[PDB]
């Protein structure tokens, strides 16, 4: 079987992408943030503290004839940005673009951090990293992808995120009309539970390509591109007036500047991020200082190929027994 669903940016800056997901019987449709950097499927629900819900669509397990409470199970997650949520666990039927999994663990939020409350357009997250990172206790639960794997035509899913435009998540098949040229596959390490791979280098604008190994993770759940300080300094040095601002929390640049492209290596192939993808607009309304889409990973501890990088490519997440990542231009 296969599944295909349209994913849509939540705002004008592509800060995140939401994808409709059907949960329960009869279907309750929630718009979830597909996150290859985490492994929990959690949703706003009728159990969430009322003061922490502000416009989100909630999952109501008592109205689903297929929902079953997972006795004694709890979950608690903390994301790298400081966000967090926690609650109890149900099992229920979950469908993505025609692809149905029965008995999927649906984690019901009882408490969410402020960053989720203020994001009225995200009803929850659908984790697509490896199941070893799932936070359900005392019995760890499997991801949607892991549960669907055996029934998929091919054990893959693909991410085709749009620039200021809708895109597609496909499960079980590779749309050969969605990309140009060939797909270049590269090795994945699962030792940390992430889709972790090694980029072969980078170039700034039309500059020389620098061959250097950059270990990082492919994370649809992170907005920006987080790279080592040496790389990020080399990029912003080519932008007149750009500087690192401690008060803002990263590199900013004059909004009137034109940004150079950024190239990263995948084996012998090259993925080019257009300069416009790196512009994330004024730091505050009316400001002439703009926030950069490439930032340092020094404070994070890991390099993150977030949406800024992934939306420049067609990305294959190959969940075979030896997993690999595929990148193609589009
Ligand atoms: N998108 C989920 C996520 C959040 C944080 C991290 C970090 F920062 F710990 F690497 C990775 C993945
Ligand atoms: N990396 C996972 C993640 C995704 C979205 C959010 C936000 F923006 F909704 F708070 C936080 C953390």
Curated annotation (Swiss-Prot):
Q: What are the GO BP annotations of this UniProt entry? A: proteolysis
Key word Signal present in the record? yes
Q: Name one GO molecular function term.
A: aspartic-type endopeptidase activity
For this protein, the Enzyme Commission number is: 3.4.23.22
EC top class, as a word: hydrolase
Q: Which UniProt keywords apply?
A: Aspartyl protease, Disulfide bond, Hydrolase, Protease, Signal, Zymogen
- What S-S linkages are listed for this chain? 255-290
Question: Known catalysed reaction(s)?
Answer: Hydrolysis of proteins with specificity similar to that of pepsin A, prefers hydrophobic residues at P1 and P1', but does not cleave 14-Ala-|-Leu-15 in the B chain of insulin or Z-Glu-Tyr. Clots milk
Catalytic positions?
A: 35, 199
Q: Which residues form the Peptidase A1 domain?
A: 17-328
Give the UniProt family note. Answer: Belongs to the peptidase A1 family.
Q: What is this protein called?
A: Endothiapepsin
Q: Which residues of the full protein are shown?
A: 90 to 419 of 419
């Amino acid at each position: 079987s296969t599944g295909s669903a349209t994913t849509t940016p939540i705002d004008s800056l592509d800060d995140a992408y939401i994808t409709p997901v059907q949960i329960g019987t009869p279907a309750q449709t929630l718009n979830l943030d597909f996150d290859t950097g985490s492994s929990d499927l959690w949703v706003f629900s009728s159990e969430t503290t009322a003061s922490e819900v502000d416009g989100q669509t909630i999952y109501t397990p008592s109205k689903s004839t297929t929902a079953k409470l997972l006795s004694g199970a709890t979950w608690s997650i903390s994301y790298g940005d400081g966000s967090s949520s926690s609650g109890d666990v149900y099992t229920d039927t979950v469908s993505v673009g025609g692809l149905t999994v029965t008995g999927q663990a649906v984690e019901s939020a009882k408490k969410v951090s402020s960053s989720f409350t203020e994001d009225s357009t995200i009803d929850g997250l659908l984790g697509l990293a490896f199941s070893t990172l799932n936070t359900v206790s005392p019995t760890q639960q499997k991801t949607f992808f892991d549960n669907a794997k055996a029934s998929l035509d091919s054990p893959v899913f693909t991410a085709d995120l749009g620039y200021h435009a809708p895109g597609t998540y496909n499960f079980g098949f590779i749309d050969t009309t969605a990309y140009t040229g060939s797909i270049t596959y590269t090795a994945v390490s699962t030792k940390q539970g992430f889709w972790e791979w090694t980029s072969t280098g980078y170039a700034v604008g039309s500059g020389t390509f620098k061959s250097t190994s950059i270990d990082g993770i492919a994370d649809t759940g992170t907005t920006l591109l987080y790279l080592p300080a040496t790389v990020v300094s080399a990029y912003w040095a080519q932008v007149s007036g750009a500087k690192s601002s401690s008060s803002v929390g990263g590199y900013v640049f004059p909004c009137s500047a034109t940004l150079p492209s950024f190239t990263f290596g995948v084996g012998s192939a090259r993925i080019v991020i257009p300069g416009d993808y790196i512009d994330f607009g004024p730091i505050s309304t009316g400001s002439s200082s703009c926030f950069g889409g490439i930032q340092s990973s020094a404070g994070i501890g890991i390099n993150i190929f977030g949406d800024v990088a992934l939306k420049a490519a067609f990305v294959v997440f190959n969940g075979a027994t030896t997993p690999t990542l595929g990148f193609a231009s589009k």
